[PDB]
Structures are given as C-alpha cells and as structure tokens.
Amino acid sequence: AKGRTPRSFSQRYGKWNAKFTAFSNPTVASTILTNVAPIAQGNFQTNVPKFTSVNEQVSAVLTQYGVTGPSRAIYQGYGLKVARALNRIGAGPALTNMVAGLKAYYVSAYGANPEILDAVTNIILGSPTGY
Amino acid sequence: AKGRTPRSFSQRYGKWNAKFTAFSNPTVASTILTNVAPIAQGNFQTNVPKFTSVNEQVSAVLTQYGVTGPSRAIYQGYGLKVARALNRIGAGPALTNMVAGLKAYYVSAYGANPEILDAVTNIILGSPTGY
Amino acid sequence: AKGRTPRSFSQRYGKWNAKFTAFSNPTVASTILTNVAPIAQGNFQTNVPKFTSVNEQVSAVLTQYGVTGPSRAIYQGYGLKVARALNRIGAGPALTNMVAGLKAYYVSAYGANPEILDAVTNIILGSPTGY
Amino acid sequence: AKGRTPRSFSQRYGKWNAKFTAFSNPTVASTILTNVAPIAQGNFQTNVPKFTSVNEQVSAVLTQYGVTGPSRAIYQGYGLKVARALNRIGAGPALTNMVAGLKAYYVSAYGANPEILDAVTNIILGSPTGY
Amino acid sequence: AKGRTPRSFSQRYGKWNAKFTAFSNPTVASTILTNVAPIAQGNFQTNVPKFTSVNEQVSAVLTQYGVTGPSRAIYQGYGLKVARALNRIGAGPALTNMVAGLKAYYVSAYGANPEILDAVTNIILGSPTGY
Amino acid sequence: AKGRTPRSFSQRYGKWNAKFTAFSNPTVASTILTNVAPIAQGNFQTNVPKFTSVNEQVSAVLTQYGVTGPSRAIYQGYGLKVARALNRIGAGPALTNMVAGLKAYYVSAYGANPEILDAVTNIILGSPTGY
C-alpha cells in the first residue's frame, strides 16, 4: 500500500516537503540517526570492502593500459557496476546477461574501449565474458 | 540507493526495530503526523470516493443475484481490485489484460461465479470484458 | 458490531479524520506505540524469517534462469504470495487450489513464464503443483 | 584537493563514521537542514515537474501496449533515464549517442522490447532515434 | 619571514597539528568564521559567475561534438583552467603562452582531442589560439 | 545523486552560503572538527612524508644546477606534481604518459629548462623518462 495510487507533482512535493520539514527538527533527526547508527555501521562494514578491493584491482589494471585522468573514471565506474551485479544477484546466467548489457551500455553510450572493458571484467569476475 | 545490496533477516529486523523505536518517541511521532496531516487528508479525499461508489454499486448488483454473507465479500473484493487497476493504469488494453487475469485469479483460487464476476465488471467498467 | 450498517464516504472520512487527529497527539501516539512495541517485535520475529528465506531461495532459482531487473520482482512477488498462503491455511487441497489460482493470476495478468513459476513453486513447496 | 590520494577501506570507514557521528548531533543536523531547507525546496521545484510529466506520458503510452505489473517499471525506468540525459546535456548529437547507448543497455541486460522503447523515446524526445 | 628556514616532516606535522587542534575549539572556529563570512561571500559573488558561465558555454559546445560521460569532464576541466588563466594575468602574450602550454598538457597527458580543445578555447577566448 | 541536475550560479551560491552559515555555528564546527581530528592526523602522517622527501631531494638537485630564487619553485612544483602522479596511479605506462604530459605543460607554459626537468624526474622516479 505504497505505490497504489498515482501521485502528481503537487502531492509528491507536498508530502516530500512535509517529511523534510519534520526531519529538520532537532529531536526527530537526532533520535532517528542515533537509533540507526549501529545498523548503518554494520551495513557499511559488510558491503564496502567488496568495492574498495575492486577499486584497487581496476586501478592496477588501468595503469598497465595507460589510462590517465577522467578516462579512468569510465572504467572504474564500469567495474563498480559489475561488482554491484555480483553483490545483488550472484554468479550465473543472469550475471552473464548483465555483463553483456553493461558492456553494450558503456561502449555505445560513453565510447569506452572494448579491450579495457574485457580486462576489467577479467580482473573482477575471472573471465572477459564472466562465465 | 535503497534496494541495491541484499538484506538478511538480522539486518531487516535491526533496521525495522531501530525505526520503530525511534517513531515511538512522543516528539518524533507527533511532528511527523502533524506535518503530514493535510496531505494525508487530501490523498484520502482524492482517492476514496471512487471506491465507496464501487462498494455501493456492487452491493446493488449483489442483492439482485441473491448473494449473502461472507460470499458477498468475494465479489466486493473483486470489484475493488478491478477499480484499483482502473485507477493505476487507466482504460485500455493493459486494463483488459488485468481484468482477464483477475477473473482467472478469483475463479480458480476462490471459487467465484463467472456470471456474477461478469455482472460486477459490467457495473464497474461498462462491459463484462471491459473494452 | 463493526460492519453492520452501511457507511458512506462522509462517515468513513469523518471517522478516519477523527482517529487520525487523535493519534497525532504526542501522548496518545507514544502511549499506544510504547505499549504495543514488544508484541510487534514478537510478531516480526515470528513471521519474517519464513519470507527472508523464500527471498533468498527464489533469488538463487532466478539467477539460474537468467532473469534480471524488474522482471525478477514478478517472480519474487509470486513466491511471497505462495509463502503467504502456506503460512495462513497450511498444506493440503486448499493450498493446491490457491497455487493453481495464483499461477493463473500471474500468467494471465502479468505475462509470467509458466516454467519459471513451476521452478519457484518447486523451490518453495517441494513440487511444481504443490501436492 | 578531494580525490588526490588513494583512500583504503579503513580511511574511508573512519572518515564516514566520524562524519555520521557528527551529523547525529541534534544541533549539527538541525542547523544544517534548517539552513539548506529553502534551497532544497527550490531545487525540487525546479527539477521534479520534468519527471512527473514523463511518468504520466509514459504511463499513457504503456497502457496502449498492454504492459502491466513490474514489467511497466522497466520502461518507466528507461523513460526517466532518458529524461535525465535531456536535463543534463541538452539536445544534440550527445543526446543521440546516449539514447542509443541506453537502448542497447536495456535491450541487452533487462530483456526490454525495442518497439515499446521506441514508443517511449518518441513520447519523450519526439522521435524514436531522438534527432 | 614565512618560508625562510627549511622545515622537515616533524616540524610541518607539529605546526599543522597545533593549528588544527587550535581551530577545533568552538570559540576559535566560530569567531574566525563569523568574522570572515562577509568577505568570503563577496569573493564568491565576485569570482564564481565567470566560471559558471564558462561551464554553461562549454557544455553547449560539447553537446555539439557528441561528448558524453566522464570524457566531458576532461574538456570542462581544460576550459576552467583557461578561464582561470584569463582571470589571473589578463589577455595578452602571456595568456597565449599559457593556452599553448595547457593544450600540450591536456593532449599529451589525458589524450584530449585537439579539435574539441580548439572549440572550447574558441568559445571562451574568441579564437582557437587566443590572440 | 550529487551532480545529476545542472546548477546555475544562484543555486551554487545559495547552497554554498547555507552550508557556510551552518558551519560557522560553534557546535557544528566544533563537533565536526573534533570528530575528524584523528583521521585527518592519520592521513597527514600517511601522505606528507613522501612529499617532504621529494622537497629535500629536489632542493639538493637544484643547488647543483645553480637555480636560485623564485625560479626554484618551478621545478619544486613540477617535482611535487610528478610525485602526486606516483601516489595516485603508481608506476607503469600511465605514469610515463603523465610524465611526458607534465614536461610538455611546464616547458611550454612556464618556460622551464628540459635538462633540469630531466634531473628532477631522475631523482624522483629513477630515470629521465620514468620507465
């Protein structure tokens, strides 16, 4: 019972503004954040190392291919996306479909190099295709 | 950034418990509910008349067919379900597909009468099939 | 003595608005919620594990079939629905009827794949039909 | 001088946890949110209408094609994605490149229909290719 | 009388740590920041529009050439660099030397396109060389 | 969800001014800086020795070539620039590309001597080219 009726811009803005004005209270904000602090820390600790490792490995790979400057970000972003998929759905045919779709996305939208995308997918998943 | 990493029972329970303990504070609950009162009233006033009208029309249809007791709720429920679809996506082929699927759902799971389902769909959408 | 007389939109709206305005009081809300907190925690701890496990098993089944993106939600939803039935009425002929009705529902309304629905029913109940 | 030295998981977690613990203070959170409230309202008002209208138009388009359930979200997501590009970089060859890349992304990863993707990008940009 | 004697790592670290501990005091930080607030507001108001304008014009030029994603940042950065030079030393032969040096820098370190760099420096300075 | 919609001068100025007014509060600044002190100390201790060492070695090299006064800063800066690259991406072909680009930058824009640039990059990376 959350997305059952259509909401126009007026209703969306009204409810978002009400909730934002509520959260600006000192007591409301401090209470909610102090209550969710340990769960947030546990989620951070559980999830972030899998992505810092990908950052380090993809950096090591990009230095061997000569990629410098903002062009590194492209491949870095790609790598993180792949890791996201691996965290969400796991290894198997679905991960293969998502690697193919992400490669098409990056190559045709951002002009990324297929060879470096293969090297990044190899350092992350073990194979260029991800099987 | 809400459904990106998998959450186990302990994580779900921890966060739900933190949020429930926070919302039990007098100031937090008071502030939130007092801020969302006018928007909640507006959403209620906008949406509920379309469903009370369906309730009355389906009641009129059900008295003509001799349906009594909890066996009424079946068709009442079905009626409301159909109205929900018309409110979400509007009239058209998608609504026809959902009406056929809902008829299958009710006839197969709950032993509803196809004739009374046709009469309810007729009083709500104008036609037994809903074109 | 709750649903014995018919209620129009004016009566529903008046009583809903009265109750909502009452609950927005700090004392009222804080008292009700602080009183029902342990019972809510107990009901959560009793019921949610049966559904987190279903989520994980259906995810595992869906990765082997190549389902990615929002198309996964369909089957996840179906799985949860099935689990709901098992929690409510138990195993037996009634569960078979509701499984057949739910499969008719999803295939005819949402374009679900029958083979993947049998796979999900197999991982949840133990058989494609659920006997 | 923000992304000039590499940060490991320990440094990232230390700084994130320090800033999160600071923001849970009543005065810190209250002051920051109260100060940024009008600017946030203005950004919301400036940007969200362009996406609410895309939601309504894409819904109208999807009901003409028979799409129901979570399978609608796919195209909704695509639509919003396209609008994002138009809001960011404007109309021109860059938008054409991004539209082609987004279609490749969705068709290859999420099993979307090319025909409905063309209909959505036509209701949004005016042409299927988007020139 | 600031950089007249050489400082080793221990001296730099000791003085920086002393100053950071001093500035963390509530009174020190609040007094300094409250005192420098209007001058900082004036410096922002005086300098930032020259760079927002460059951002908008370079965005318009980049959309005409098909640049998308992080590869846009490259050119954005170059543009801002050139704009910075124009703000610092003014128009003249010195600005010509610096524009040539920045073009060499970006083309040979970040693999930028000479044509798009010429276009960006044309929209900013008036001509590709900047005379 | 940080740099997704375009921000004009008035929006940037408004948000910057809001955050600056907030940080000038005694409690806000005190809390944030006191919380981040140990992580900032660790980051300083981790990164700065690599740059003080470069300063001392480049000083020794510059005194052998007879460079005095502000004309020293040029090479000092260039040295630190190269060290920055070594800290960010590490040794490899990308570092070679960046060293070549930095030499082009400094020789063309700031009129530095290629021989002293070779000597500085030789004391820093081990070779004039940096392989």
B45 CB near a chain C CB, below 8 Å?
A: yes
Token representation of residue F74 = 């040029």
The shortest C-alpha distance from F124 to chain E (Å) reads 18
Structure-block tokens of residue A8:
């126009």
Residue of A nearest to D33 (CA): A24
Method of structure determination: cryo-EM
Tell me if D66 and B94 make a contact (CB, 8 A cut-off).
yes
* F100 close to F66: Cβ distance less than 8 angstroms: no
Query: CA end-to-end span of chain F, whole Å?
Result: 40
Residue in D23, A27, E47, A16 with CA at minimum distance from that of residue F22: D23
Q: Do the Cβ atoms of C82 and C122 come closer than 8 Å?
A: no
For residue E66, the chain D residues in CB contact (below 8 A) are 92-94, 96-97
The CA-based diameter of chain C, rounded to the nearest angstrom, is: 54
Distance CA D101, CA D85 (A): 11
Angle at B36 between CA B30 and CA B42, to 5 degrees: 145
Q: Domain span at residue D79? A: 48-131
Place of tokens 């029913």: C121
Specify whether the CB–CB gap between D50 and A9 falls below 8 A.
Answer: no
Chains A/E: 3 or more C-beta pairs closer than 8 A? yes
Closest to C97 in 3D by CA, of B110, B75, B101? B110
Spatial neighbors of F21 by CB under 8 A, at least 6 apart, are: D35, E37
Q: Are there at least 3 beta-carbon pairs closer than 8 Å between E and C?
A: no
F41 — contact with chain D (CB < 8 Å)?
no
CA distance A131 to A91: 8
| Whether C111 and D69 lie within 8 Å, measured CB to CB | yes
Q: Hey, what's the torsion of the CAs at F14, F18, F19, F25, to 10 degrees?
A: 160
Encoded tokens for D73: 């979200």
Angle at E84 between CA E82 and CA E85, to 5 degrees: 65
Q: Assess contact for F100 and E108: CB atoms under 8 A.
A: yes
Helix (DSSP H) and strand (DSSP E) numbers for chain A: 6, 0
Angle between helices F93-110 and F114-125 (to 10 degrees): 150
- Which chain D residue has its CA at the smallest distance from F31's CA? D22
CA angle E28/E34/E36 to nearest 5° reads: 100
Alpha-carbon distance of A32 to B87, in angstroms, equals 35
Q: Please give, rounded to a whole number of angstroms, the shortest distance from the CA of B38 to a CA of chain A.
A: 9
Binary contact (E70, A110; C-beta < 8 A): yes
- Resolution of the structure, angstroms: 2.8
- The amino acid at B110: Y
D24 near B CB under 8 A: no
Question: How far is CA C84 from its chain centroid?
Answer: 5
Asked if A126 is an interface residue toward chain C (Cβ–Cβ < 8 A), one would say: no
d(CA F12, CA E103): 29
| Token pair 């800290």 in the structure block, residue | F87
Answer for the pair D53, A54: CB distance below 8 angstroms, yes or no.
Answer: no
What angle (nearest 5°) sits at the alpha carbon of residue D29, between those of residues D26 and D31?
Answer: 95
C11 touches chain B (CB under 8 A): no
- Selected residues 76-105 of chain B with any CB under 8 Å from a CB in chain A: 84, 87-88
Q: A12: number of CA atoms within 13 Å, CB side?
A: 15
| C-alpha to C-alpha distance for D121 and D108, rounded to whole angstroms | 17
**Is residue B18 a contact partner of residue A35, using CB atoms and an 8 Å limit?**
yes
